[PDB]
Amino acid sequence: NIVTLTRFVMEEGMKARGTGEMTQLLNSLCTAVKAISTAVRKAGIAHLYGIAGSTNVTGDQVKKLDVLSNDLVINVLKSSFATCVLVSEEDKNAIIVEPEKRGKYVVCFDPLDGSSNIDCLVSIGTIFGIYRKNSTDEPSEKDALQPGRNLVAAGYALYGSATMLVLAMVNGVNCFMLDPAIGEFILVDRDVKIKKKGSIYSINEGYAKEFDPAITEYIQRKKFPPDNSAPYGARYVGSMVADVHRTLVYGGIFMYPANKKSPKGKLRLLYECNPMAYVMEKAGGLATTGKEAVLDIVPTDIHQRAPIILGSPEDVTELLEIYQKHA
Amino acid sequence: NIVTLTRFVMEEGMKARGTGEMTQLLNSLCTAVKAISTAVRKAGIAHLYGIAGSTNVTGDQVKKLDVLSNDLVINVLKSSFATCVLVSEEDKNAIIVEPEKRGKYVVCFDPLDGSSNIDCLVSIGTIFGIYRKNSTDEPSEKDALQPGRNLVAAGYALYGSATMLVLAMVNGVNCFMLDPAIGEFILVDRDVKIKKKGSIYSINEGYAKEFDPAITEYIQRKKFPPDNSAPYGARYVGSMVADVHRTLVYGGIFMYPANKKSPKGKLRLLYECNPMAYVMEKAGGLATTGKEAVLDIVPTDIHQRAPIILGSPEDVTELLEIYQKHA
Amino acid sequence: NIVTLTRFVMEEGMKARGTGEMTQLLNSLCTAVKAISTAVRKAGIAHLYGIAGSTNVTGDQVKKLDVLSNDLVINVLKSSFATCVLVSEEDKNAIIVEPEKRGKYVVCFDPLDGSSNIDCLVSIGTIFGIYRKNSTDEPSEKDALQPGRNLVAAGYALYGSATMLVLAMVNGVNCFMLDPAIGEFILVDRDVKIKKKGSIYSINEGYAKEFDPAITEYIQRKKFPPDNSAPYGARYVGSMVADVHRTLVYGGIFMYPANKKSPKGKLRLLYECNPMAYVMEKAGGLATTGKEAVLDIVPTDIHQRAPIILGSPEDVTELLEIYQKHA
Amino acid sequence: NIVTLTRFVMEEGMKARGTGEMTQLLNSLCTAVKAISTAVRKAGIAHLYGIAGSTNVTGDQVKKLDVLSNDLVINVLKSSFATCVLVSEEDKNAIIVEPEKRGKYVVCFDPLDGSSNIDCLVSIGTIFGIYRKNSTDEPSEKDALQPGRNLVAAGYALYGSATMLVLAMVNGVNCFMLDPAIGEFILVDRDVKIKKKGSIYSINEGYAKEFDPAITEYIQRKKFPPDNSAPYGARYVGSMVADVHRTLVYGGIFMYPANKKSPKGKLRLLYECNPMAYVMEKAGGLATTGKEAVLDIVPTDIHQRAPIILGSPEDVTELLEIYQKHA
Numbered sequence A, B, C, D: 001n002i003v004t005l006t007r008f009v010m011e012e013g014m015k016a017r018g019t020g021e022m023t024q025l026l027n028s029l030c031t032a033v034k035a036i037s038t039a040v041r042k043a044g045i046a047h048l049y050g051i052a053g054s055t056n057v058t059g060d061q062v063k064k065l066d067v068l069s070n071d072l073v074i075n076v077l078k079s080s081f082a083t084c085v086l087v088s089e090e091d092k093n094a095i096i097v098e099p100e101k102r103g104k105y106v107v108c109f110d111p112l113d114g115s116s117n118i119d120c121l122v123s124i125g126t127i128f129g130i131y132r133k134n135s136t137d138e139p140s141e142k143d144a145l146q147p148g149r150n151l152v153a154a155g156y157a158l159y160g161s162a163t164m165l166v167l168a169m170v171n172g173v174n175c176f177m178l179d180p181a182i183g184e185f186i187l188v189d190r191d192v193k194i195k196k197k198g199s200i201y202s203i204n205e206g207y208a209k210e211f212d213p214a215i216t217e218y219i220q221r222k223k224f225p226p227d228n229s230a231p232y233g234a235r236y237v238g239s240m241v242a243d244v245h246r247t248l249v250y251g252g253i254f255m256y257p258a259n260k261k262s263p264k265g266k267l268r269l270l271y272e273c274n275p276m277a278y279v280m281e282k283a284g285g286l287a288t289t290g291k292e293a294v295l296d297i298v299p300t301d302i303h304q305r306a307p308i309i310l311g312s313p314e315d316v317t318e319l320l321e322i323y324q325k326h327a
């Protein structure tokens, strides 16, 4: 049995005696992600560069990748009839779905993450988290302000050497490779579980001067292991989706701690940190800010940042025991 | 007008009043890079997973990506009738072309580079360097022991968010985007030059304990600038092709020095360091061991390794200055 | 609202307060049809012709298109958990789905129709009809012996200049174009209705010598209109799916009447005639054998043939009034 | 070895000790045919239908397939710098290349042929015929009024179940399959020859009332063979490119004679009849008006029409014999 993601979600829904909305919702995301992937890989770029004389559409229009990505997600998500509140990294306000198309899901998303890496063609991705609305009020921003602990599903699509969609739900984590030949996601790793302990550490050490004593100490340990074991390898792609995906698949740890330009860290809680934390923990990993569990923070700003440290349970706890020691 | 690599290469050939072997070799490489790209993006992977039954080999009998890539490159290059000796990272010995397919060119390639990043879907790529044969005598592995300085052409294909072929010839570096919808590389940047000074450093800091004192000092400057300027950001994909390309386009520096565990460095002179060193110098940047230009090393072994430091000229110059100050 | 076929079927199922099986079933067919289309358009054919030296799979294997098509459908259909009996044109016996994977639907199909046209690259297609099982007995052949009047859904995918999936159900007929860039079928014509009267007639007139008086007379009329109107244009592609699709879209009429090599006509009732008749009639057209309604014939052999005349209501009735006149 | 059209064309050029303009023109055509093929198969059609919002023009402002095709062909051909005069079915007047892009070649093309079949998804295609300029004098429309006999190259791309480019040059006809996964046409049949005698006839019998007595008699022979052999099958896609290709590969005959409503026939001499006549004769078949070779007509108008009868030599010879018997 080849498992497609379309089959997988539908079977999931039929297990849960669902109304379907979530199936429709996840089918929408899949469509959006294939469309984003096709654009990310620059399909049709000959037309931008004049293969048919320009002409074509009459008056100036063209989109950056990030704008298209955002358009696809929002339109695809609305079309689902499964959502009521959308939080995109690109919209300073929560988007409230028009009643006609209103469903019960709230969706926080980064349509295209890793923007520093777009122009150099490095891996970038799409990140999403989904809540059920838990109010009877008019859907509004407040419905997106839930701790990540309430996520019913989250994951990301990585547009890398190949395109992979990682979906996490209450039961666990599954990876589906996009076969772009047939536009189908194929389950290739069922019930993914991160190694307890890794040998890779991923952080932007350019901020060394701004790190707290606890990060600084952990980093020296990765380099000069006190047990005089082999030092960890370093990897930082610079696109959270690639770096997090490699953490998931090879183990190790990823850090975006606080530093002065952000004391609250850089990464956004609702649509960067939370969905990654939910995937990590569903895979048997950890995601802490250094002081508290990421998924337990009750947000009060849909764009608030959080520091995040995530990955293998014994790497992350080793760091957390360092914070615990210094405090 | 839109410029395709096929047209470009062909005009370059016509200008030259060459015989056309170079042209045939490069159309060859293009065809191979597109065929590696489609396989890297995992097209038709659903057949591997049983979409059409025939379900026994969900394990490893079917070709790894590196073996397929190597086959594609060796085979396409042989059929161009333009080469006589080939050096692949994947074969212990130089391959000598059967006389019937013998051209005048020598090709040193890494069919898929970035192997540690293959399982996690991070960017990977293809690196080639092309020599004219110097000798009259029967072609042999010695024919490929020429300093990169003697390169007639070199470049790489990056299979990243999109696929890009970067080609550097005598008169400069050009970047061609692959539009996979029509199987055509489009000139997107012409006469590429790296910027004088970057703000990014790329090196695997996990080897901190093994770095010589100049690498050590230089890294300290990137994090704690003595003159109090902004610290450099850090980036390290873990795939030379991705980190190089990011250096070309955004500026900064890429480092893989010798370390006490690897004394002569890790990266292979003929089909990793030279081609990239050549690209870099053609783009106004530098590529050094820390003591001598990379392109000036006289290779004594086709699998010889070399330390390499490359990128913006002011950044590489600064570390060169550190090495001379350390004697 | 862009409508994908995945969304459309799911919304259909959620309207009908379904268990899902039919949604899972139609999602399976979609996947099969994209995979068939990708193969039909010869994606990967470079490998057949040695781009990477052969090698690849070790010992002889390769499939004809028709064999692959059949494999895809059967495996995809079984995987659905929605079927119990499958009738393929390629299997001399009905296929009884193993209990583990048994669903309640019976599916009759031509995985690849128009075989005379494959080697010359003309349009070919896939044809399907679906019944609910209407017995409590062990699923068996007899469950596939239902008149087409009991179909819950039928249609075809045409692999032509583009790939289109035409789905007919109790409510009517919808056309979805395959956008092979994202592997999604896009609803492009809702609730399709055939013109009452066409101006095209499609038949293999090479059998003129064997036609009954009624076909012969109608044909002379198409050529020499008794009202001295412009004669009908003639089109016969030779692949029922193309010819029928053009009948549906432009109107007119298609005939595969009885002749000596077949007195019962050539086309197979269960998986050629019936699904096409169901589409035609759902679009406001007709499908007769010349004497009786195609969809009312109770089959007794899963491979039995029927003569078929179909298309615009006034063309078909004009022919039927000719049969009525001669009898 | 695998032979790509790019390699083939390039070797053909090298052999010739040509300047390379022919080579550049044909790489040009290849690039255009792949770009028409991808658009014909409807890639990215979901953007036209609102997948990313921007929903106003679901009507006709965006480019018809024929206009896009024409733009692609004119533009790509101009940029090859190998042509001086172009004749497109879509432009009333010959197009004269601006001096800066002037080569030595004259191209007569039908960018998309098969227009009546475009809406129903039946096969369609691209037909080109390439002349050397005969004159010294400023290029003009007269430069394209040369008998097909003077053709240096001609062929067609069929966008059928798969896309195939058929190219006929002085030394014969070769068929190249497009593998759209890597954007590469693969030589699949070399030195193609049509069979002596076929069993298929292709003609639009709707004009029966307008056919001269020789066409009339010949058709009667196909259906009721005087010598009691098996009647010919009939086939008529309605797209010259598809019906021709089927004639090339399976043998038989294709007919578009003059009829009283169209006295000089329907098909255009320069960019429908000639190129196909040339292909046919290069493959050992014939192409006649019924009274003279098609390739020997001296065109007096770039949009001149001509009756054409083509295919297996014995089949065409037999109808020629009928015409001479009718005076």
Ligand SMILES: O=P(O)(O)OC[C@H]1O[C@](O)(CO)[C@@H](O)[C@@H]1O
Residues within 6 Å of the ligand: A113, A114, A115, A116, A204, A238, A239, A240, A241, A256, A266, A267, A272, B233
């Ligand atoms: O350049 P920095 O500070 O290392 O930030 C990189 C981070 O920025 C982001 O693009 C912001 O989302 C993340 O993908 C990534 O991890």
Ligand SMILES: O=P(O)(O)OC[C@H]1O[C@](O)(CO)[C@@H](O)[C@@H]1O
Residues within 6 Å of the ligand: A233, B113, B114, B115, B116, B204, B238, B239, B240, B241, B256, B266, B267, B272
């Ligand atoms: O794990 P490390 O030592 O940092 O290796 C990274 C290097 O490994 C390689 O894959 C070796 O070829 C390069 O692509 C890359 O630069």
Ligand SMILES: O=P(O)(O)OC[C@H]1O[C@](O)(CO)[C@@H](O)[C@@H]1O
Residues within 6 Å of the ligand: C113, C114, C115, C116, C204, C238, C239, C240, C241, C256, C266, C267, C272, D233
């Ligand atoms: O060659 P003939 O007798 O005209 O038969 C053509 C018919 O054969 C089939 O391939 C048999 O399915 C149909 O697609 C088509 O209509």
Ligand SMILES: O=P(O)(O)OC[C@H]1O[C@](O)(CO)[C@@H](O)[C@@H]1O
Residues within 6 Å of the ligand: C233, D113, D114, D115, D116, D204, D238, D239, D240, D241, D256, D266, D267, D272
């Ligand atoms: O409807 P008719 O007259 O049979 O026309 C068919 C001919 O029309 C054309 O489209 C005219 O270009 C050809 O492709 C085809 O052979």
Ligand SMILES: [Mg+2]
Residues within 6 Å of the ligand: A066, A089, A110, A111, A112, A113, A114, A115
């Ligand atoms: Mg973003």
Ligand SMILES: [Mg+2]
Residues within 6 Å of the ligand: A089, A110, A112, A113, A114, A272
């Ligand atoms: Mg982001």
Ligand SMILES: [Mg+2]
Residues within 6 Å of the ligand: B066, B089, B090, B110, B111, B112, B113, B114, B115
């Ligand atoms: Mg390698």
Ligand SMILES: [Mg+2]
Residues within 6 Å of the ligand: B089, B110, B112, B113, B114, B272
């Ligand atoms: Mg390598």
Ligand SMILES: [Mg+2]
Residues within 6 Å of the ligand: C066, C089, C110, C111, C112, C113, C114, C115
């Ligand atoms: Mg079949």
Ligand SMILES: [Mg+2]
Residues within 6 Å of the ligand: C089, C110, C112, C113, C114, C272
């Ligand atoms: Mg059939």
Ligand SMILES: [Mg+2]
Residues within 6 Å of the ligand: D066, D089, D090, D110, D111, D112, D113, D114, D115
């Ligand atoms: Mg045309």
Ligand SMILES: [Mg+2]
Residues within 6 Å of the ligand: D089, D110, D112, D113, D114, D272
């Ligand atoms: Mg035409």
